[PDB]
Structures are given as structure tokens and as C-alpha cells.
């Protein structure tokens, strides 16, 4: 759902409302229905509410960096000029509410309405097409609320106790509702450890087989050694989803939503994310997270560290004045020492802050921010650049809590204006690369189900290493994960592990690792032999849907957008006017001769090295006996 202003909706749906004015005999002549709607005579509004029903509208924010920049929503009429946007789709639009504007479009034909309702509808587009990871999931306030809800604190009221020859456990409840009653009276803290008899929540796999010979069913009681908040969070998940009993870091919520998307219908996860949104907002409102000058703690170790590094700087000053050191080399040494000082102060700040302080709570919860910003806030700003991009040797030892001195602030302004100025150039470079990728990917469409070729590419799944064990590659999620197998995985004894043509997901990865497989052969578009476009089997599954890509879907434009959209996160070319990032990406896609070129062996053999004073000479004696 999305909220539309009443006047805006009236003007958008003008002919559609006029039709019902004539049909309801609120107006006799359509040429008079035009005037009736244009004057906003009070009868039209109630017509609009029925014309607007179940007619979706397309919402778009500029720039449209990828597919999810346009999403369909069900319009609800609302008072006021502002469009009401669902908080979960904001990250897909890259939108925030400091002034941004969005455009609204109305599909007319039956085909267009069906496309908006089936293809572009927001509830059907949870996962990112670039990586398959969820995007419409808790953020900011909601992450903080759930993290507070599911955190376990020790020493709180009503917590579990052991039998002590004088009283029973003193921390057990017959049902979660009894714990709710205890919480409402202030006897039990939501974050306190307790034991609860659960009958509606599925136990963990470790407990299910141990407690139920034929599996758990609703109504079967078990004892959960978990906080009340964790139980309340688990009640938001599907009825058949095992109890998690964990602190809901953003990563853990992403894992749970991944499980839901992979193993449950789309509507189920769509409803689950809404429930998590509601709970997160509630417990964010009631988490107590606030900022005050008292909460911004300064580590007491700061001054000792600063004095030590000042002694080091004085030693370098003595050595420079003694003629043993160059000006530029003095700058280098001072920069490195003050970088060490910044790291020391960062560690001191991170170890000094209490775990439950709001400032560190927001960062460590994964809601937003990072430790560098916290160090700048309460530690020391550190080194800042001059207009030429060189570090100024003398750091900003003050923090924004203390307030900078005049010259510290003045030297700080340089990099700030640099960043403000170069952002448009960064955006332009990213857009140019994206445009070229789109232009080259114009005709890559899934044309057929299968080309039936047996070609493929090798993917390493793990390395045996010293222990001969299952050290899976960390980046496997982007190489083997989500692809069709080209040939059966076979063990040393000749038995297969996974059939040809299977979708290589996480269960398949676990099965392969458990069977000792380190390398597989997988189908790829590089080897697809289809006469036109590509075939579905060689492409594999759509990352957004998690199922085999449908015939006709334009994988080329999706790939171009996926590559180009994160372009601004890469290190850019110099605008001061070898560093990697976008400059090398453009180098690779243009097939240009590398500036930092390295020769490669033409033939396999043994190397005879004939180094010179400032050059190298290498000869390869081929093992084949050739030249």
C-alpha cells in the first residue's frame, strides 16, 4: 500500500471518476461531469474512493539506478499533500524524508494493470536482483527495536534461579501470557532470562528430535530457556519455523529473512516483514535510545596516549632539526605516528563504553553508523587532508564533543568541500559506465529453456589444506551459489552426490562439503551454445525470485544495472587532475592493454633467471623439449 493525496488522486483518476458520475447520475452530461470534478463538488470524493480501489499505481524516485526504482502499490486516499511511503521500500528507492520527492504514474490498459499487479508489485520484489539478498527488511529504528527486544541482560528482575534448598527455581512460567502478566506488573523484565512452557512455537531442531520421536506439532509442550522478548519475537515468525533464541543483529535478521524467502511462499515473507516492522517500531520507541551530552563518553586514556605520541613527535622534531631527516619524510613519520594514535584512541573508546550506552548501541546493533564516526564524535577527529589530498601532519586532536579550535576547523573544511564538489563527477562516471554496459547488453534475452549442451566452467568449492578438511571459499556465494550443475558430483568411490541439472543452493553446498567435494563443474552463460540470446538452464535461477529464470526475461539489462548501481562505492579516478576500482573496471570491460602490464608464460617449463643491474631477463626451458 501507498498513500495518495485526495486532490492528486482526483486529478489522476479524472476520466475514471467522471465515468461513475455519469453512471451514478450525479451528472447528466459528461461535458458537465468535467466541470463537476474540476470544481471538486463534494459528491465526487465518495466516487473516487471506489474508483481508486484495487487500481495500482507506479511509484518512481529519481535517479532510477536499478529495477526496484519503480514499484507498484495499492493507493489509499489520505489527507494532505504528501505521499505516504512504506518504510521498508525506502531502501529500494534510496529515499529518505528530508525533502525528497517521488513521481506517480497510473497504468490504464488491462495488460498494464496486470503487469503492475503481478510484476512490479512491491510485495513481490523483496529480494535484490543483483545478489538475491533481501532489501525490504528492518532498518534503523526497527533494527534497534528488535535488537533491544531480543537482547539478554544479566541481573534483571524476575530472572531464573537455581534450586537452593530453600525455594524453587523462582523463574518459571506456565505460558508466555503469564510472563506478559508478570511484565505488565513490573515483576519481570522483558530482557531477563526465564524458563517458559511453550506449546505454539516449534522447538529448535536440536530439541525436536530429542523431545518428540515423531516430530513436534502445535500444542505439544516444551520448556524454553529464553527471555520473554525472544519468545515475543519468535511469535512473529511462521507457525512452522523453529525457535531461534538469538540476539537479533541485522545479520541474524537477514539470515532469517533469507530462510523465509528460500523455503516459504512470497506472501508469507511479505507478511512476516510487516510484523517485524511493527514490533521493531514499538520496541524502538520503548528502547530508551537517546542522545545527551552525558551519554557521549570520552575515554580517560586519551590524554596519556596523546602525550606519548607528542613525545614521539618531539623526538622526530629533534631528529629533523639535527639534519637526519627530510621535510617530506618528517611529514610521513608524523602522519604514521598520529594514525597509530588514532587507532589507540579508537580502541580505548570502544573498550570504555558500556555495552548498553545509546551511542554505541546504535552502532553495534547494526542499525546505522560505524565506529569511526563514534571515534570522531568522542575520541579525536584525527588527520585531515589539504586541498592537494595530502595529510596535514598535525592532527585535529579535539573531538566534536570538546569542540574544535578555530584552525582545526579551518583545516577541516578542505576535505569537506572536496567531497561536496566531486560527488557529481563520481555520479557521472558511474552513470557513463552503466550506460555503456546497457548499450552492450541490448539483445541478451532468455530465448529458450535449454540448449542441451554439456559445456561448463569449473568452480572451486573448498580447499583441503593441511587438515584435509572442508575450508569452503568465503566468496562461494557469488560463484557456485545459485547455478545449474553441468555434470554429476562424484566421490572417490564412484558414487554420485548431486544429480546433473540441479540448482546449486545452500543445501546442495552443505551436501557437497559433507561429501568431501572441493570442485564442481557448473553451467554458465559463457559456455551457453544457444544460437540467440541465452537459455534458462545456463543462466540458472533469477536472484530475485529464487527459481529458474523465466523465458523472455532480459538478463542483460538486469546485469548491466546490477553492475552499474554500486559504481559510486568504488574508488574513482583522480579529479585533482595504480589505484583500483572503477578506473580498472572500465579498463577490463574495454579490453585495453593494462598500464601495469605483466608478461605471461607462453609455454610450460623451467625458469632460468638472468637478472641485470636494473632490468630482468627470463628464459623458459619448455618441459616439452620445444624452443
Amino acid at each position: 500500500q501507498c498513500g495518495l493525496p485526495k486532490l492528486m488522486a482526483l486529478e489522476l483518476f479524472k476520466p475514471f471518476v467522471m465515468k461513475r458520475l455519469v453512471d451514478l447520475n450525479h451528472a447528466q452530461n459528461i461535458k458537465s461531469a468535467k466541470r463537476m470534478v474540476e470544481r471538486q463538488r463534494p459528491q465526487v470524493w465518495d466516487v473516487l474512493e471506489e474508483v481508486i480501489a484495487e487500481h495500482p499505481v507506479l511509484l518512481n524516485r529519481a535517479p532510477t539506478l536499478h529495477r526496484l526504482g519503480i514499484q507498484a502499490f495499492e493507493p489509499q486516499l489520505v489527507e494532505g499533500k504528501a505521499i505516504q511511503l512504506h518504510p521498508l521500500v525506502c531502501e529500494a528507492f534510496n529515499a529518505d524524508f528530508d525533502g525528497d520527492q517521488m513521481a506517480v504514474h497510473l497504468p490504464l490498459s488491462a495488460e498494464a494493470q496486470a503487469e503492475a499487479r503481478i510484476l512490479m508489485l512491491s510485495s513481490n520484489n523483496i529480494l535484490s536482483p543483483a545478489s538475491g539478498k533481501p532489501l525490504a527488511m528492518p532498518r534503523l529504528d526497527m533494527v534497534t527495536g528488535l535488537y533491544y527486544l531480543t537482547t539478554l541482560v544479566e541481573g534483571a528482575t524476575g530472572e531464573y534461579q537455581a534450586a537452593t534448598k530453600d525455594a524453587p527455581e523462582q523463574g518459571v512460567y506456565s505460558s508466555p501470557a503469564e510472563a506478559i502478566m508478570a511484565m505488565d506488573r513490573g515483576a519481570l523484565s522483558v530482557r531477563a532470562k526465564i524458563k517458559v512452557r511453550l506449546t505454539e512455537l516449534r522447538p529448535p531442531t536440536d530439541l525436536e528430535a530429542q523431545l518428540f520421536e515423531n516430530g513436534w506439532k502445535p500444542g505439544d509442550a516444551w520448556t524454553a530457556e529464553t527471555t520473554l522478548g525472544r519468545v515475543m519475537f519468535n511469535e512473529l515468525l511462521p507457525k512452522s519455523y523453529p525457535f531461534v533464541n538469538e540476539q537479533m543483529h541485522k545479520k541474524v535478521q537477514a539470515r532469517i529473512i533469507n530462510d523465509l524467502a528460500e523455503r516459504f511462499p512470497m506472501i508469507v515473507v511479505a507478511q512476516t516483514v510487516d510484523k517485524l516492522k511493527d514490533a521493531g517500531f514499538y520496541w524502538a520507541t520503548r528502547s530508551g535510545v537517546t542522545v545527551s551530552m552525558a551519554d557521549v563518553l570520552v575515554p580517560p586514556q586519551k590524554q596519556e596516549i596523546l602525550e606519548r605520541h607528542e613525545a614521539e613527535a618531539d623526538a622526530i622534531e629533534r631528529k629533523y632539526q639535527r639534519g637526519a631527516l627530510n621535510h617530506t619524510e618528517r611529514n610521513e613519520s608524523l602522519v604514521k605516528i598520529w594514525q597509530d594514535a588514532t587507532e589507540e584512541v579508537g580502541k580505548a573508546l570502544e573498550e570504555f563504553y558500556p555495552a548498553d550506552n545509546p551511542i554505541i548501541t546504535i552502532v553495534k546493533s547494526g542499525a546505522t553508523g560505524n565506529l569511526t564516526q563514534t571515534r570522531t564524535l568522542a575520541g579525536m577527529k584525527g588527520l585531515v587532508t589539504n586541498p592537494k589530498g595530502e595529510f596535514i601532519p598535525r592532527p585535529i586532536k579535539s573531538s566534536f564533543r570538546e569542540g574544535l579550535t578555530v584552525l582545526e576547523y579551518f583545516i577541516n573544511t578542505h576535505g569537506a568541500r572536496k567531497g561536496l564538489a566531486d560527488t557529481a563527477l563520481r555520479t557521472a562516471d558511474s552513470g557513463y559506465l552503466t550506460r555503456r554496459l546497457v548499450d552492450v547488453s541490448q539483445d541478451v534475452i532468455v530465448r529458450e529453456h535449454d540448449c542441451e549442451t554439456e559445456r561448463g566452467i569449473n568452480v572451486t568449492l573448498a580447499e583441503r589444506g593441511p587438515d584435509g578438511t572442508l575450508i569452503r571459499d568465503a566468496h562461494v556465494e557469488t560463484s557456485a551459489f545459485a547455478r545449474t550443475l553441468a555434470t554429476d558430483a562424484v566421490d572417490a568411490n564412484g558414487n554420485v552426490i548431486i544429480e546433473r541439472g540441479h540448482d546449486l543452493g545452500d543445501p546442495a553446498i552443505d551436501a557437497l562439503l559433507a561429501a568431501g567435494i572441493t570442485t564442481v563443474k557448473v553451467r554458465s552463460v559463457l559456455t551457453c551454445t544457444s544460437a540467440t540470446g541465452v537459455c534458462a538452464m545456463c543462466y540458472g535461477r533469477s536472484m530475485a525470485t529464487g527459481k529458474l529464470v523465466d523465458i523472455g526475461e532480459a538478463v542483460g539489462i538486469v546485469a548491466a544495472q546490477s553492475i552499474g548501481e554500486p559504481g559510486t562505492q568504488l574508488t574513482m579516478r583522480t579529479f585533482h587532475q595504480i589505484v583500483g576500482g572503477l578506473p580498472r573496471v572500465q579498463e577490463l570491460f574495454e579490453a585495453r592493454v593494462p598500464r601495469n602490464k605483466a608478461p605471461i608464460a607462453d609455454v610450460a617449463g623451467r625458469v632460468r633467471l638472468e637478472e641485470s643491474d636494473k632490468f630482468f631477463k627470463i628464459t623458459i626451458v619448455p618441459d616439452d623439449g620445444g624452443e
Binding site: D98, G288, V291, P358, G403, R417
Partner: protein, 674 residues
């Protein structure tokens, strides 16, 4: 005031936004004390437009020079020299904040100084040639008006300085509780306030004029601008502050301007703010407001629109402004006068008549209220060649109608503090729904926590704390002795009553310890209760469920500005209308009922979805096709199926264009030529 002091690098004989590199945009160490490093536009004019520093003046050759105190033998002296950057590079200049004991000698033996390389160093105290005259020698006027500037990041300080300039005047102005020393001089030098030229006594006071008798015995009369329209449409009302018979000295403010209270500038309102998330209605920087602000017109503003219509002549004769428009209903011209001009004080609706005019063919060509506009007709101005009006050729009459509209704060309107903490009002809550203090006072505004830590503008928090210390009084006990934290406070700051305004200049003001001590020393409320603890937090109550929040929340007073980005004219909608002619695509314009652009990136997104039919609608029916448009509109009106498009209209023109060049272009079926 900032526009008059603006420095522009782009213009005739200068540079341009199109190709000016970052080198000219970058801040330079020579800018110190001459050009403000903070106050510059954020768009393509970044770095190209700046502001003159407050203490800077222009060398007769055109070079900017700034004043410095002379220093010799480690003792500062009162001689002031205005140095250019070329002159300054030949000297060592110390930091103004450097401590000096009796008769000017530096207390410490090492001093921060600026050096020709644009460098900063600890030189010997006897190695200094000059010193800055003020800590804020580098800032401009708008930058100097940000309290706790040094606690805010440069980007957010820039945003706050820019936003101060786009704050709309309010119906009643209120000076900030927490301010700088700069508001008064900035307001006086802006010139919107009326100032007595010579000492005297007030003889007359009226809403329109003020009359003074000087000690010379001569008499002066001052005229006040009432409800005058500004270039941007904001109200420029001037108000008298002096009473009859009052002593008025030369230079004393006699009438407030649009954004001044008692002479000092007042761009916003002091609101009771609580720093907490709240039910997700302030998510992603959205703002929650109490309905009180709407009820009491705390954030209400007046805007005046100006409409023109001129009666001219043509080959087929002259044009007439007249009430006798053909075929218009008798009531539609009721509010019009005998000449056909709407009377003053009439409430005019969207699309209503303002001035009736007809032209030969006669035709209806009357001036009508634009889409969405409304208000009260506040004024009429008329010009005729019979009165030697000096209008251009080919015009016989001209009429200007002024329409006044009073706008309350509403959803979607932008608000912002002085620290760059901009936001959009997402919800307005009834007074009983707002979280309220144990005293019963409901907070006016709720600002989300998750904004402050990442954006690095804690100066808004500090102000908030000091704001409370300004609303509630404070009293430092001195019976036994001055507390150590208060040992740097002047004796005048040891106590102050409630609602007492304070000044915390941008680089010489309240320190952290002083603010904490003052928080500990606040007076109790009416009932004798200390509402906010020493840490600036309070035990708020939930206005809906009624139970207290489980943790104390930061509460205080913050100065909030209403920005000119109001919703009333930021909204657009269209369903067919006027169209371009040389090529048949829609128009684009705020007041021209134009449609939204569909760029190639949006087409890429549609292609990625594979929503072919929607893309076709956007490409052909909604944009270029004429026949398709008439057909689809009549289909919607008739409630029948939208026809599935056949042969594209662009293709048929392209085919004939190709054929005209002797190219045989043929449509081929999958089974053969056709």
C-alpha cells in the same frame, strides 16, 4: 544581507558552472578571514559562490584585506593593521584565543600560528608578528548565527547556514533563547528594521507611521511597510515597538522587520523538543509536531501572490477590460466591480475570475486564479495610458491583483534547525497524544535519535540543553565559594530568571563543564519540581497508553525554522491537457500543468521488469500519439477496453521518410515477405 555580501566567481568575463574545475572551487589557506569556508551553495555553484567574512573589507585595488592586532616582543598591542593575503604571507599570525596576562604578554611560551604554506605550528611566543582580532574572524554573517558551530561537522554547518537564508517569515517573530551576539547587528544592518536617525521623543505611534521630535526641536516621520509583497512572495510587514512619549535615542530600533523581535533577528520559533524515536512516525528524519503549533499559529506564515493582465490593441482593434463577458453566468461576475476588477476583500477560489477582459475575433480572455491557488484579494493596482502611465507600446491598460493567503504548518512541509537537521513533517499529533512531562506539559516536537550520531551535529543537542537552561532559570550557589566548573563564568552568569535569553558565540561560548553545571543548577518549575535532571533528561509519559517510558528522554528547547519548500506548490498532477506543437509531446512547468518526464533510465527499469505493455503506454499513448490519446481517453470515458495498439504511428512516418530517399523498406512476416 547575504546576497549583498555575496562573492560570485561566475559571470561576464569570469568562469562558468559548465567547466569550472575543482581547483577554483577548493578552499584555500589564503581565504582565512576574507572568504567564508562554510557558507556556499551545495549544487553546481559549489565553491563558485561565497560570502565575505564579517571583518573583511575591500582594498581600493579590489583585494580583500582583514584586520590583525600587532604583536611584538611577545606582548600584544592595540594597533590594528588591515593586511592583504600577499602582505599576510610575509608574517606570522597567532590564534586570537591565545591566552595573555596583564598588559598583553602571552602566558605560555608556545603559540599556534599560521604560516605561509597555509600551515599551523607551535612557534615560540616571541616569534609572533600578528594576532587575529576575533575567534570568528573567518566566518560570514549566516555562519556566525549558528550556536556551537565548532561542535558541528563542516557539511552540516554549511547546510544550516544555507537553510537560515530560506526560512520564511512567520506571522509573529520570536527571538531564539540560545543565540549568538550576531543577531542584533545582522538585523540592524539588513535594514528591514526602522531606526531613529536622531535622539528625540515619540510624538505619535500608529500601525502605519511613527512620529518623533528630536532634541533639536525638528520633527521626523517614519512610514512602515504593511503587508507588502517581497520578491519571493513572503510578507514584509513592519510593526511599531515604541510607545507614545518614549525616549528614543539615535540608532535605536523603532519598528521591527519581518523576522525581528526587539530589533534582533528572529527566523524561527523555540519549540520543546524530545529526542527519541516514536512509533516510526519520525523514521528517516521525519518530524512529529504537536497540533498546538497548528492551533496557536506558532508556525503560520503569510504569502502574497501577484497576477497581471493588460488590455492591448491588435490589427482587429483594441481590447476591453469589462464586466460584460459573453456567456458567463451572472454569479461568476458578481464579485467584480464596474470596471471588471474583483473587489478587495473577496475570497477567490481556484479558477475564479480576477479581471474580466475580452478581445476581438468577442472572446473570453479574463484573468483567472491558477490551479491550486486561493486567498483573499489584498490589493489592486491599475495603470492606464490616459494617466501617462509610461507603459510600453501596444498596451492601453494594466491591472495587478494581489492575493493574500495564510498558511498553517501542514504535513509535508520542511522544517530545519540551525545545524542542518532538516526534515519533513510526517505526522501532526493531538495535544493529548504527544508525550508529556510529569508537569503535564506536552512536548512540541519529536526528533529521532538515529540522526544525531551519524550526521555529526551534536551542536543541536547542546543547544537543546542550553535551551532548557534558558527557559528555566538557574542559580549557582556561592555561599561557601565559587564551584570549580563555574570558575570561568562572569559574575553576571551566576544566576538568571526564567525565559532569559543567552548568547554563546560560535568560537567563544559555553564549554561542556559549564553547560553540565548549569543543567545541575536549573530553577525548579512552578510547583517546585526539577523537571530535567543534570544530564538533560526527563521522565516522559506516553500520551496514548499513559504509562511512563522505561527510560528518561533528552528534553529541551530548540530553535526551529520554517523553510520555503512548502507543499502547496511542490505538488503536480496531470491527465491530458495542453501539448507541444512543433513536436507533440506534453509541456513541462509548475504553472503550465505539465506532465512528468520519463527518462531512459526509467525505460531501462521497465525493460528489466519486462512490463512491455506499460512501457508501450508510456512511450506512445501517453507521450507522442495524438490519435491514440483521443481514442484512449474516450475509451476510458465510455468504460470500454483500451484498444490494443496496432501499427505504431512513429513507424509509419519513419517508413515514408526512408522511402522518400529511394530506400525500399519492407515489412517481413516470419513466413515470408509481406
Amino acid at each position: 544581507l547575504t546576497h549583498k555580501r555575496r562573492l560570485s566567481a561566475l559571470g561576464p568575463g569570469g568562469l562558468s558552472r559548465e567547466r569550472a574545475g575543482l581547483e577554483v572551487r577548493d578552499v584555500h589557506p589564503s581565504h582565512y578571514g576574507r572568504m567564508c569556508p562554510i557558507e556556499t551553495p551545495e549544487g553546481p555553484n559549489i565553491g563558485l559562490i561565497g560570502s565575505l567574512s564579517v571583518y573583511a573589507r575591500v582594498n581600493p585595488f579590489g583585494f580583500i584585506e582583514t584586520p590583525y592586532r600587532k604583536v611584538e616582543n611577545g606582548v600584544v598591542t592595540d594597533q590594528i593593521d588591515y593586511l592583504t593575503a600577499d602582505e599576510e604571507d610575509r608574517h606570522v599570525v597567532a590564534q586570537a584565543n591565545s591566552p595573555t596576562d596583564e598588559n598583553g604578554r602571552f602566558t605560555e611560551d608556545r603559540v599556534m600560528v599560521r604560516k605561509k604554506g597555509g600551515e599551523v605550528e607551535f612557534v615560540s611566543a616571541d616569534q609572533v608578528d600578528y594576532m587575529d582580532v576575533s575567534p570568528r574572524q573567518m566566518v560570514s554573517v549566516a555562519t556566525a548565527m549558528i550556536p556551537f558551530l565548532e561542535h558541528d561537522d563542516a557539511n552540516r554547518a554549511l547546510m544550516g547556514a544555507n537553510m537560515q537564508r530560506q526560512a520564511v517569515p512567520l506571522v509573529r517573530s520570536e527571538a531564539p533563547l540560545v543565540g549568538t551576539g550576531m543577531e542584533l547587528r545582522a538585523a540592524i544592518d539588513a535594514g528591514d528594521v526602522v531606526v531613529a536617525d536622531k535622539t528625540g521623543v515619540i510624538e505619535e505611534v500608529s500601525a502605519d507611521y511613527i512620529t518623533v521630535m528630536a532634541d533639536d526641536g525638528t520633527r521626523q516621520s517614519y512610514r512602515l511597510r504593511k503587508f507588502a509583497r517581497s520578491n519571493h512572495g513572503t510578507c514584509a510587514n513592519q510593526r511599531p515597538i515604541v510607545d507614545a512619549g518614549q525616549r528614543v535615542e539615535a540608532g535605536q530600533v523603532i519598528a521591527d522587520g519581518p523576522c525581528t523581535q526587539n530589533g534582533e533577528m528572529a527566523l524561527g520559533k523555540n519549540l520543546l523538543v524530545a529526542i527519541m524515536p516514536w512509533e516510526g512516525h519520525n523514521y528517516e528524519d521525519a518530524i512529529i509536531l504537536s497540533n498546538r503549533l497548528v492551533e496557536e499559529d506558532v508556525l503560520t506564515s503569510i504569502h502574497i501572490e501577484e497576477h497581471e493582465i493588460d488590455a492591448r490593441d491588435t490589427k482587429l482593434g483594441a481590447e476591453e477590460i469589462t464586466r460584460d463577458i459573453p456567456n458567463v453566468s451572472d454569479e461568476v461576475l458578481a464579485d467584480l466591480d464596474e470596471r471588471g476588477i474583483v473587489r478587495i476583500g473577496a475570497e477567490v477560489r481556484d479558477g475564479d475570475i480576477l479581471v474580466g477582459k475580452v478581445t476581438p475575433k468577442v472572446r473570453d480572455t479574463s484573468l483567472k486564479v491558477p490551479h491550486g491557488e486561493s486567498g483573499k484579494v489584498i490589493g489592486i493596482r491599475v495603470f492606464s495610458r490616459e494617466d501617462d502611465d509610461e507603459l510600453p507600446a501596444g498596451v492601453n491598460e494594466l491591472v495587478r491583483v494581489y492575493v493574500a493567503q495564510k498558511r498553517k504548518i501542514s504535513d509535508g512541509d520542511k522544517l530545519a534547525g540551525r545545524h542542518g537537521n532538516k526534515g519533513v513533517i510526517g505526522k501532526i499529533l493531538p495535544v493529548e497524544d504527544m508525550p508529556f512531562l510529569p508537569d503535564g506539559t506536552p512536548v512540541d516536537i519529536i526528533l529521532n535519535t538515529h540522526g544525531v550520531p551519524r550526521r555529526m551535529n551534536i551542536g543541536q543537542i547542546l543547544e537543546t540543553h542550553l535551551g532548557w537552561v534558558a527557559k528555566a532559570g538557574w542559580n549557582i550557589d556561592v555561599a561557601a565559594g565559587v564551584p570549580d566548573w563555574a570558575s570561568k563564568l562572569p559574575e553576571e552568569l551566576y544566576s538568571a530568571p526564567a525565559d532569559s535569553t543567552v548568547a554563546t558565540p560560535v568560537f567563544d561560548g559555553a564549554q561542556e563543564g559549564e553547560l553540565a553545571g548549569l543543567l545541575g543548577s536549573t530553577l525548579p518549575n512552578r510547583d517546585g519540581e526539577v523537571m530535567v535532571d543534570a544530564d538533560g533528561k526527563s521522565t516522559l509519559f506516553d500520551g496514548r497508553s499513559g504509562e511512563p517510558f522505561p527510560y528518561p528522554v533528552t528534553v529541551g528547547y530548540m530553535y526551529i525554522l520554517k523553510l520555503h519548500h512548502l507543499v502547496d506548490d511542490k505538488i503536480h498532477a496531470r491527465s491530458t491537457g495542453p501539448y507541444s506543437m512543433i513536436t507533440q509531446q506534453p509541456l513541462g512547468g509548475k504553472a503550465q500543468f505539465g506532465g512528468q518526464r520519463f527518462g531512459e533510465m526509467e525505460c531501462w527499469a521497465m525493460q528489466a521488469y519486462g512490463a512491455a505493455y506499460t512501457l508501450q503506454e508510456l512511450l506512445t499513448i501517453k507521450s507522442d500519439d495524438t490519435v491514440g490519446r483521443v481514442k484512449v481517453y474516450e475509451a476510458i470515458v465510455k468504460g470500454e477496453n483500451i484498444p490494443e495498439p496496432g501499427i505504431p504511428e512513429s513507424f509509419k512516418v519513419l517508413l515514408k521518410e526512408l522511402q522518400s530517399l529511394c530506400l525500399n523498406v519492407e515489412v517481413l512476416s516470419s513466413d515470408g515477405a509481406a
